[PDB]
Every structure is written in structure tokens, then in C-alpha cells.
Amino acid sequence: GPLGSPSKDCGSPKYAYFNGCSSPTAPLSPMSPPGYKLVTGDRNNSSCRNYNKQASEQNWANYSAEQNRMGQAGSTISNSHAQPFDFPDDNQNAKKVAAGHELQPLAIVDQRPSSRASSRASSRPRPDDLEI
Numbered sequence: 001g002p003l004g005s006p007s008k009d010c011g012s013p014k015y016a017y018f019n020g021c022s023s024p025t026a027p028l029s030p031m032s033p034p035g036y037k038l039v040t041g042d043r044n045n046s047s048c049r050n051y052n053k054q055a056s057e058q059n060w061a062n063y064s065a066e067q068n069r070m071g072q073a074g075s076t077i078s079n080s081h082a083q084p085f086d087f088p089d090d091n092q093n094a095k096k097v098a099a100g101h102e103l104q105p106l107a108i109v110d111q112r113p114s115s116r117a118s119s120r121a122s123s124r125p126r127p128d129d130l131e132i
Contacts, residue, residue, distance in 0.1 A: 060101070069096070 039047075070093075079089040100106065111117060 066096075069093075 073093060082089060
């Protein structure tokens with residue numbers, strides 16, 4: 001035998017170099033077995049100390065039409081650090097979302113007034129009220 005270091009360098013060379021054993025064992029251990037309940041009330045674990053460190057941010061909806069805005073915002077050039085405070089740069093980009101992040105962004109009322117846009121269809125006199 002190639003007598004030398006019969007200890008596999010304590011912990012194997014690095015991984016295994018098995019190459020491909022057609023092992024269905026794709027996952028690692030924290031796999032999601034047949035879970036038929038989700039929450040139904042009891043979070044099961046409270047859903048807080050699980051550590052996801054994934055996704056990043058896909059629960060807000062970018063709409064895919066704000067980049068142009070971001071382009072401007074940044075094109076203005078003024079806050080290239082936001083380290084000292086970054087307070088002034090937290091009203092616009094924060095308000096354009098505040099008006100919708102509460103529950104609903106729109107609902108056939110983007111204008112708000114509902115009185116303008118000639119929604120009356122010529123409902124105004126001229127002299128005072130057609131009374132001369």
C-alpha cells in the first residue's frame with residue numbers, strides 16, 4: 001500500500017471529487033418535505049429566526065417602470081454617499097411609494113379630485129347662470 005498519510009488530511013481532501021454518482025441526493029438537509037399546512041395560524045416556528053439571506057426584495061413589486069425615475073434621481077448628482085445623513089434624499093423616492101404601499105397603489109382614481117378632467121361635460125354657465 002502507498003503508506004504515507006492514512007488520515008485523508010483530516011476531513012477529506014476538500015469535498016469528495018466523486019464527480020458524478022447519479023446520486024438523487026441533490027439537496028443538503030434543510031429541504032422542504034411534503035408540507036401541507038404552511039401556517040394556517042400557528043407560524044410553527046414564529047417565522048423570525050430562520051435566516052434566509054436570499055431573495056433580496058421581491059415582495060414590493062418594482063412594476064418595471066421606475067428605472068427611468070431612478071436614472072433621473074441619480075443623474076441629478078448630489079448624494080453620492082448618503083453616509084453623513086441621507087435625510088434630504090428620503091422624501092421623493094419615499095413618497096412616490098408611500099401613496100400605494102399602504103394597501104393599494106391605484107383604483108381608477110390616480111387623479112384624486114375626480115371633479116377636474118371635465119368630468120361634468122360642460123356643466124358651467126357663462127354670464128352667471130343663463131340668467132343674463
